[PDB]
């Protein structure tokens, strides 16, 4: 169903081009969170706000390639980026063309979500090594109404569900305020190499402060951390929601993989590392 | 299910202290070195 | 305190203002996305509860007529003063009549749905019922969150507004509702004040009978304290009857067998209260 | 079933009210509901 890929590109474009407000909930085993995402474009420049609706008034804003983090009690700062991370699932900001060579876009049909008829699409890596996504996108605005992150064997890890939303060809006023606002201050060859990486993953950065490397396939990302110390340093595996942390020791070396990978997949990477 | 405010929310600023450390760096790293 | 009054205001706002609440309903069955629209036109209420995902289930209210719509079923209308389960019962409660047997206690103010809310608890005085915690908008006075708690502090159900708005004037969608060609009113016996030889000797403080019917004969007696309701059903015990205690979220079902009679309590009550009531029914 | 991820709960709030030893208590359950709505005197 090549339509599937076309539909996903349409959803991406809509998320990038339209002015709109999504009132949604984010669901994981840690609870149900009320959130609000605002997006617009002023003079071909993206404006956006992700606001926590209950409890402390934490918010993340975007303007151009600048991302500001606010949180009462703590102190504001800004980073460079093309979009707010965790304001919408990564699936929305992904470039389906790039991962088309290692991902299958399967149409599941149409169904009603948030009082809208939506196209339902499954995004699965062909090699079966990763979590998969199921998207419910509004057939009219093309915006995502629901997004489920699933484990390789169908276990729902996380849910994004729109409850109310509006599309305005006209720019909000509060977004105009953000348009003029003064945002807070702005803020490598390694030894070993991972012999096995799921199809499509590529290194994007490196660093230290332990030997760490960051990987990403355009949708999911994970870091493979290596340090050679061992107090109680032991073999363990934990999953804080979609985030996995696989730790193992060998050759007097601790191997900690952190990220969006199924436990089995992470473990395999740790073992297939050829030390220098 | 009834937990109104999940710890580590979506709008939060970017022995069990070794992992929670590599966990916070992962978050910063995917934001500093994000993509597009 | 000011609480009791705040609650009357919240209730009044719910029946007076024109508004739309986009909320979720959380319990053990899952998280349901719903929308409730309310308005007044020509001296009568207009309302619509819409199921947002899957089948377009919907309930509409025009004056005292409640119409139900479900894909693949013949619509039908009943009489009622509002759509039950469109909002928690607490919101359709007359706090005045309740004050004699409930305490209204303040927990403070806090933010919900980007609004500053007055946080109030509603708990029976004779500690026999489930309690409520309500978060209401200081400006509009509309409910933003409502938690139904069982007697050990655990949450049975949560009502949570994700988005809403208050309109000074009626939307076009409600305007059409008034003109809507709604399904015919169905007739169902209402007002039976049946006579029974068995009587509930003990009842928590505040309940009263609001119906008595003999609706395989079952003799049902419906009660309500203005907030919670339950029915006391009696039929002749059989060869293989048994004491039972089932719990479906907020609804309890307690079957008590005594003197060849099969007693069953059904409703919004802690299991213990339901049983104590069942073993205090005097036959003959 | 992790109650949390189920978006279409059994017997949602907008479900139509049914008119008409376990199945006997399933009938005592929906009769309680039918009653609640036939007697909502707010
Ligand atoms: Zn309990
Ligand atoms: Zn409409
Ligand atoms: Zn009545």
| C-beta of residue C68 within 8 angstroms of C-beta of residue C56 | no
Q: How far apart are the first and last CA of chain A?
A: 45
Contact in structure between D34 and C84 (CB atoms under 8 Å): no
Tokens in use for A176?
């105009």
Length of chain D: 42
Q: Which pair of tokens denotes residue A264?
A: 């089995």
The DSSP bridge partners found for residue A212 are: A207, A225
Contacts of A206 (CB under 8 A, 6+ apart): A188, A189, A190, A212, A213, A214
Residues of B in Cβ contact (< 8 Å) with C31: 1
Q: Are A53 and C113 in contact (CB under 8 A)?
A: yes
What pairs with residue C57 in β-bridges?
Answer: none
> How far, in Å, from the CA of C268 to the mean position of ligand 1?
14
Question: How many angstroms separate the CA atoms of C254 and A12, rounded?
Answer: 54
Q: Which two tokens stand for residue A73?
A: 């009690």
Question: What is the secondary structure of C260-283 as a DSSP string?
Answer: TEEEEEEESS-HHHHHHHHTTEEP
Query: Dihedral sign, CA of A229, A233, A235, A239?
Result: negative
Phi/psi at B31 (nearest 5 deg)? -100, -40
Resolution limit, Å: 2.3
What is the distance in A from the centroid of ligand 2 to the CA of A82?
Answer: 34
Full set of structural domains in chain A with CATH: 1-186 (2.50.20.10), 187-276 (no CATH)
Gap between the Cα atoms of A146 and A260, Å rounded:
19
Nearest to A206 by CA among A223, A192, A182: A223
C117: left (phi over 0), alpha (psi -120 to 50) or beta: beta
CA distances from C117 to A123, A204, B7, C2, C134 (A): 41, 46, 22, 14, 9
Residues A121/A101, Cβ–Cβ less than 8 Å: no
The encoded tokens of residue A145 equal 């109404």
Q: Dihedral through CA C136, CA C138, CA C141, CA C147, nearest 10?
A: 0
- Give yes or no for a contact between C148 and C128, defined as CB atoms under 8 angstroms apart: no
Determine how many CB atoms are found less than 10 A away from the CB of residue B23. Answer: 18
| Tokens 């473990």, located at residue | A267
The strand ranges marked E within chain B are none
Note the residue count of chain C.
284
CA angle A2, A105, A205 (to 5 degrees): 120
- Candidates D2, D4, D9: best to mutate against A (most CBs of A within 10 A) is D4
* Cβ contacts of A43 within 8 Å, gap of 6 or more: none
Yes or no, beta carbons of A148 and D2 under 8 Å apart? no
Closest chain A residue to B26, measured at CA: A223
> Residue D4, by phi and psi: left (phi above 0), alpha (psi -120 to 50) or beta?
alpha
Strands C18-27 and C30-40, by their bridges, are antiparallel
Q: How many CB pairs under 8 A join C and D?
A: 131
- Report DSSP letters for A40-75, one per residue: EEETTEEEEEEEE-SSS--EEEEETTEEEEE-TTS-
How far, in Å, is the centroid of ligand 1 from the Cα of C185? 41
Measured between alpha carbons, how far is B18 from C3 in angstroms, rounded to an integer?
48
Instruction: Please tell me the number of the ligand nearest to residue C210's CA.
Output: 3
Place of tokens 């049914």: D18
Rounded CA gap, C253 and A100, in Å?
A: 55
What is the C-alpha separation between C7 and C96, in angstroms, rounded?
9
Q: How many residues does chain A have?
A: 276
């Amino acid at each position: 169903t090549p339509a599937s890929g076309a539909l996903l590109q349409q959803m991406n474009l809509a998320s990038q081009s339209l002015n709109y407000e999504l009132s949604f909930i984010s669901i994981n085993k840690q609870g149900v969170e009320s959130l609000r995402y605002r997006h617009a474009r002023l003079d071909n420049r993206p404006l956006a706000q992700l606001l926590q609706m209950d409890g402390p008034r934490r918010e993340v804003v975007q303007r151009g390639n600048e991302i500001s983090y606010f949180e009462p009690g703590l102190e504001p700062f800004t980073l460079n980026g093309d979009y707010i991370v965790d304001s919408l699932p990564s699936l929305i900001y992904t470039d389906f063309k790039r991962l088309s060579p290692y991902y299958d876009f399967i149409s599941v049909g149409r169904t009603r979500i948030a009082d809208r008829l939506c196209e339902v699409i499954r995004v699965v890596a062909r090699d079966g090594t990763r979590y998969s996504y199921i998207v419910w996108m509004d057939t009219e605005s093309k915006l995502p109404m629901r997004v489920d992150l699933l484990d390789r064997d169908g276990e729902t890890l996380e849910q994004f569900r729109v409850i109310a939303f509006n599309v305005n060809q006209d720019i909000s006023s509060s977004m105009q305020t953000l348009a003029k606002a003064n945002l807070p201050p702005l803020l490598a060859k390694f030894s070993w190499t991972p012999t096995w990486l799921p199809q499509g993953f590529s290194e994007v950065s490196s660093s230290r402060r332990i030997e760490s490397r960051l990987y990403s396939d355009g949708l999911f990302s994970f870091s493979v951390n290596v340090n050679r110390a061992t107090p109680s340093s032991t073999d363990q595996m934990l999953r804080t929601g979609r985030r996995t942390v696989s730790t193992s020791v060998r050759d007097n070396a601790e191997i900690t993989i952190v990220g969006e990978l199924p436990p089995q997949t992470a473990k395999r990477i740790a073992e297939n590392i050829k030390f220098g | 299910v009834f937990n109104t405010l999940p710890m580590m929310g979506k709008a939060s600023p970017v022995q069990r202290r070794r992992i929670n450390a590599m966990l916070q760096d992962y978050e910063l790293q995917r934001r500093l070195h994000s993509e597009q």
